[PDB]
Amino acid sequence: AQGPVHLNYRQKGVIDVFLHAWKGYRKFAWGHDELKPVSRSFSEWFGLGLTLIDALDTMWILGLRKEFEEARKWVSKKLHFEKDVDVNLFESTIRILGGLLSAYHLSGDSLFLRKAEDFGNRLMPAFRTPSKIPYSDVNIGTGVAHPPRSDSTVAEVTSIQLEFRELSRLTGDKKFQEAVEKVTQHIHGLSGKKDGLVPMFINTHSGLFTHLGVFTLGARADSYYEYLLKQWIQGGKQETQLLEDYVEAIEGVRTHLLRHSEPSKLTFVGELAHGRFSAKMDHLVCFLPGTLALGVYHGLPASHMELAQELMETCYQMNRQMETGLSPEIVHFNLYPQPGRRDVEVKPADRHNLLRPETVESLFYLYRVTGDRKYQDWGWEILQSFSRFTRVPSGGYSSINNVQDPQKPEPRDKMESFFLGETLKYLFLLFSDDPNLLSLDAYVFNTEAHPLPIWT
Ligand SMILES: [Ca+2]
């Protein structure tokens, strides 16, 4: 139990956490999608070693080469896509394809690229629709795609571009990029948006937005905005339409979803349903200050930086206002000026924490762009909370049901793959004082924290 001497104490700490988490995966869920830390068991979503693949690049970046080699062997011998299983196009793309692509780039091991190309081909049947807008699910073994148990969600079909574009770039096979870019282009000219803000669903037959008039930056839409900017960055900042749509969208957020709480005036993003504003902010929305800061770094308006800094503070508060120091799934703010009234309110139904990375993810970007060490300090505090309230003695960490009860957080007995793929990776990078480590200038992270090279 020892780590490299050159590591500053905070990265060192992240590694200790990763090791305790991995200890659980190896002992009770090796080769399985997710670990059930409490019951020392495991769960299967796709049956593709999800946690392992999602953690490949994180292990490499943390210098856990021994563990990486071991995981590599499993991919080499146990990973088989010749399976009769339905997978979500979006979910499998960001974790499996994205994870394999990053692993390939960091290790230089062709195995990961071979698996990526295999997986990518099995996903293509999803685009066989009248509109070319892909179905939500696709059976990687039978080759048949189909809608949800309905239309497809907008964020899902517009948050797979980074991965598909890179696969085409590496293989020379243009079908991946062309299919994915068709979607992006179709969305670009689609009416039904509200100043850049997009609806949550789109019909695969008509190719039109559905559930019109309802807008959120949380689930079903969050990554759409994220990928407009990241694709532009990935392509060497030459695709102006992407930039324009992004800039328009941020203005749309300002004009329609941005409000301030009372009495502290915390800047937050709410939801809009047919003209009615809802002061409801899912933790998922905390990806925004990071994306905003990332844009500023690449030449976007300084107003984006002000907004970034304000939302980072709010996100930080969503975490720190809780008794465990961990943000709940959803937070309701107050617009009603009332003396004794606070700003943050959480409904008993939304007090869970699934070990989400959104806050630490944005801390990473805010730090890289501003250089303010307070963002590192904030991340260290959140890590402490994960260690104190989610740690499972036998190994691993678990999502919890009550973020407001430090005496009884109530483990849900589940470690999501993104805890190791995203949360611990962003924290490790946040604590790095080397701006050249996965520089914002040379790499762009997909929505599951898998770095991809910026095209030259
Ligand atoms: Ca994400």
Curated annotation (Swiss-Prot):
Its main location: endoplasmic reticulum. It is a single-pass type II membrane protein. Keywords: Calcium, Disease variant, Disulfide bond, Endoplasmic reticulum, Glycosidase, Hydrolase, Intellectual disability, Membrane, Metal-binding, Signal-anchor, Transmembrane, Transmembrane helix. It is found in: Endoplasmic reticulum membrane. It is an enzyme of class 3 (hydrolase). Optimum pH is between 6.5 and 6.9. One of its GO terms (biological process) is ERAD pathway. Ca(2+) binds at residue 447. Its EC number is 3.2.1.113. Changing residue 156 to K: In RAFQS; disrupts stable protein expression. Changing residue 91 to Q: About 44-fold reduction in K(cat), slight reduction in K(m), about 100-fold increase in binding affinity for Man(9)GlcnAc(2) but no change in binding affinity for the inhibitor, dMNJ. One of its GO terms (molecular function) is mannosyl-oligosaccharide 1,2-alpha-mannosidase activity. Disulfide bonds join 286-315. The keyword Transmembrane applies. It is linked to Rafiq syndrome: An autosomal recessive disorder characterized by variably impaired intellectual and motor development, a characteristic facial dysmorphism, truncal obesity, and hypotonia. The facial dysmorphism comprises prominent eyebrows with lateral thinning, downward-slanting palpebral fissures, bulbous tip of the nose, large ears, and a thin upper lip. Behavioral problems, including overeating, verbal and physical aggression, have been reported in some cases. Serum transferrin isoelectric focusing shows a type 2 pattern. Involved in glycoprotein quality control targeting of misfolded glycoproteins for degradation. It primarily trims a single alpha-1,2-linked mannose residue from Man(9)GlcNAc(2) to produce Man(8)GlcNAc(2), but at high enzyme concentrations, as found in the ER quality control compartment (ERQC), it further trims the carbohydrates to Man(5-6)GlcNAc(2). Belongs to the glycosyl hydrolase 47 family. This is Endoplasmic reticulum mannosyl-oligosaccharide 1,2-alpha-mannosidase. It comes from Homo sapiens. The lineage of its organism: Eukaryota, Metazoa, Chordata, Craniata, Vertebrata. The gene is MAN1B1. The chain holds residues 243 to 697 of 699 of the full protein.
